Nucleic acid binder design. Structure first.
Lengths: 207, 49, 300, 57
RNA sequence: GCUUGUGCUGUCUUCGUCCA
């Protein structure tokens, strides 16, 4: 048999942190835990007890001029991106810049060659799911007013048809819950719909 | 332990006269022995007796 | 192909995402990567995906067999006969295709399974192929006297346990260090245990469950480098006693096995873990054998 | 974590993964911290919802 | 980075307080 096998840096790291070198390397986003906040750096801890630090250039955005302590405090965990890993010393440096924490989405290295990958199908499914995300729900509006009636434009005109000239009805507007359509009889078989824009609304159903 | 504070007790477990006390403070510190558990496994003498 | 279940369940993080839209993958290259085909089959069995085998030149074979079968007549009667023959031939192809697809699928499945079986065999052999640690100035195969030190986790209240075993494989003495491992008292007590009691271990093993064990390893290495704790050699550059990390799958499984409890009814779990580490250093093969059924659950 | 089911003897299992709240931490898509027992809803897919039982990676 | 401490009997007896 071969002599006793001595663990190396990668094997020792995997044994201690129970995290593989592949799953913990450059270009990965992990929810680290803030442990100490300082003006020039922030000391954070990962899930696997790996102590990390970030130099002041990356805790806050380059455009912002605030203080690290005001924005982030102890116990406020944030997402971070791995920049460097000291496997021997179990030390890592992180970045809070959104160019890493947000843009890194397709982190897999799957070969997307059109000859062997159906890019068109994945794209089509992508707009399908994005349109599904765009899909929402809407409901009717209820208002309490003596001259308010939940009628269509033609319905309001027909309701005012049986009434003499000058009678007024109020119905929801098609421009949104912040708009109100008022229909009044200008003349026999002649009606005017006037849109009213609402400001400082307490509620969608409120006036 | 009681939820009060033990910081007003002296070395002998008795409070000293002249000390202002409030409700739920500990004025007499007393302990009763308990057979130790298997915590002697890996506790550095920090096991409840 | 993807079913609706496949359309919804294959996420960018799921292992099935590697072949969510694969197309025209060569069969001959599959045998070199058996796990991809195995995972495709597993996803198919889950009702998510559908695997299809197709030939670019299927029309070529159909036309060639038709030309062999078709008649050379040109009359409208011959045209009707040729049409009937071609339609029956197309129906025969429709019936025949699924069976051939299934046969080819089974053949590739067997090939990939055999390849992965051989790969797992080689990985296990590599895992279990290691002779016991050879102390210096001794021939290979000699069983060394070993000392294991461990504390497990390193939280406030984590004493360091020490277990020493001789070359005979029988436990000789177990000691507790109840002071802080960073104190001078810990180092002095460890030095006294190492030297005064004539223990003279050939190699010292250190292991744990987290990164806190690294500091203990560094402290022990510094102590060894400072006190010049050279190995006793039976009757001159005396060599230092080696301190290394120890793989502890077998130790972790041994600390929970009832075999240790029957063997050591009055010992802590950490003592059993240290004994398992020491036995693994003495003889990895026997420790791997001791797993019995739990050896199959090892990450091979 | 993969989504499959296994059957193993109690001995074969390594040990329980005792994790403190300082270790068992979850962050949602928007970056707001979510703790144990909270109710969240899947952003896409089946868009299901439920209470968090355990957080790992 | 050293991190904070949650739990109380029971049964008699007596003497009292406010109405009655």
């Amino acid at each position: 048999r071969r002599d006793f096998h001595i663990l190396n840096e990668a094997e020792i790291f995997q044994l201690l942190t129970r995290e593989t070198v592949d799953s913990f390397r450059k270009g990965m986003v992990i929810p680290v835990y803030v442990r100490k906040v300082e003006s020039s750096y922030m000391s954070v801890s990962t899930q696997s007890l790996i102590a990390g630090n970030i130099q002041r250039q990356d805790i806050l955005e380059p455009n912002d001029r605030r203080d690290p302590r005001e924005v982030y405090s102890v116990g406020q965990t944030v997402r971070a991106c791995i920049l460097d890993v000291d496997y021997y010393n179990f030390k890592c440096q992180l970045s809070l810049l959104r160019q890493f924490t947000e843009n890194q989405v397709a982190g897999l290295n799957v070969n997307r060659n059109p000859k062997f990958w159906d890019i068109e199908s994945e794209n089509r499914d992508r707009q399908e799911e994005i349109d599904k995300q765009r899909e929402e729900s809407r409901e009717s509006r209820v208002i309490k007013h003596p001259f308010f009636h939940n009628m269509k434009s033609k319905e309001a005109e027909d309701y005012l048809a049986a009434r003499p000239v000058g009678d007024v009805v109020i119905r929801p507007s098609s421009k949104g819950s912040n708009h109100i359509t008022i229909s009044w009889k200008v003349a026999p078989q002649l009606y005017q719909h006037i849109d009213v824009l609402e400001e400082n609304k307490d509620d969608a159903n409120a006036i | 332990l009681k939820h009060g504070t033990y910081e007003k007790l002296d070395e002998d477990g008795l409070i000293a006269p002249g000390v202002r006390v409030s409700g739920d403070d500990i004025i007499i510190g007393k302990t009763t022995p308990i057979p130790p558990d298997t915590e002697e496994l890996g506790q550095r003498t920090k096991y409840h007796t | 192909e993807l079913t609706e279940r496949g359309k919804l369940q294959i996420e960018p993080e799921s292992p099935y995402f590697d072949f969510k839209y694969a197309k025209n993958r060569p069969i001959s290259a599959l045998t070199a990567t058996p796990d991809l085909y195995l995972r495709m089959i597993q996803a198919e069995n889950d009702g998510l995906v559908n695997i299809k085998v197709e030939l670019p030149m299927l029309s070529t074979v159909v036309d060639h067999f038709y030309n062999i079968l078709k008649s050379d007549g040109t009359s409208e009667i011959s045209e009707k006969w040729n049409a009937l023959r071609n339609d029956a031939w197309k129906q025969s192809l429709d019936k025949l295709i699924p069976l051939v697809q299934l046969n080819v699928k089974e053949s590739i499945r067997r090939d990939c399974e055999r390849v992965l079986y051989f790969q797992v065999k080689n990985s296990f052999t590599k895992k279990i192929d290691q002779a016991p640690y050879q102390p210096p100035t001794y021939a290979k195969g000699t069983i060394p006297r070993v000392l294991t030190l461990s504390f497990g986790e390193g939280n406030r209240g984590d004493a360091v346990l020490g277990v020493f075993m001789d070359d005979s494989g029988d436990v000789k003495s177990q000691i507790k260090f109840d002071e802080d491992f960073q104190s001078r008292d810990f180092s002095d007590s460890l030095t006294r245990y190492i030297k005064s009691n004539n223990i003279n271990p050939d190699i010292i093993g250190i292991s744990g469950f987290n990164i806190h064990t690294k500091k203990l390893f560094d402290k022990v290495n510094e102590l060894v480098n400072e006190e010049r704790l050279t190995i006793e050699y039976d009757n001159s550059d005396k060599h230092l006693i080696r301190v290394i990390y120890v793989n502890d799958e077998t130790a972790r499984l041994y600390q929970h096995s009832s075999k240790s409890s029957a063997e050591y009814p009055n010992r802590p779990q950490l003592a059993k873990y240290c004994i398992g580490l020491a036995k693994y250093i003495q003889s990895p093969l026997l420790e791997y054998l001791a797993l019995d059924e739990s050896m199959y659950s090892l990450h091979i | 974590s993969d989504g499959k089911l296994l059957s193993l003897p109690p001995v074969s299992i390594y040990s329980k993964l005792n994790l403190n709240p300082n270790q068992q931490i979850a962050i949602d898509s928007n970056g707001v911290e979510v703790k144990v027992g909270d109710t969240v809803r899947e952003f896409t897919g089946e868009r299901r919802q439920g209470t968090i039982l355990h957080v790992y990676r």
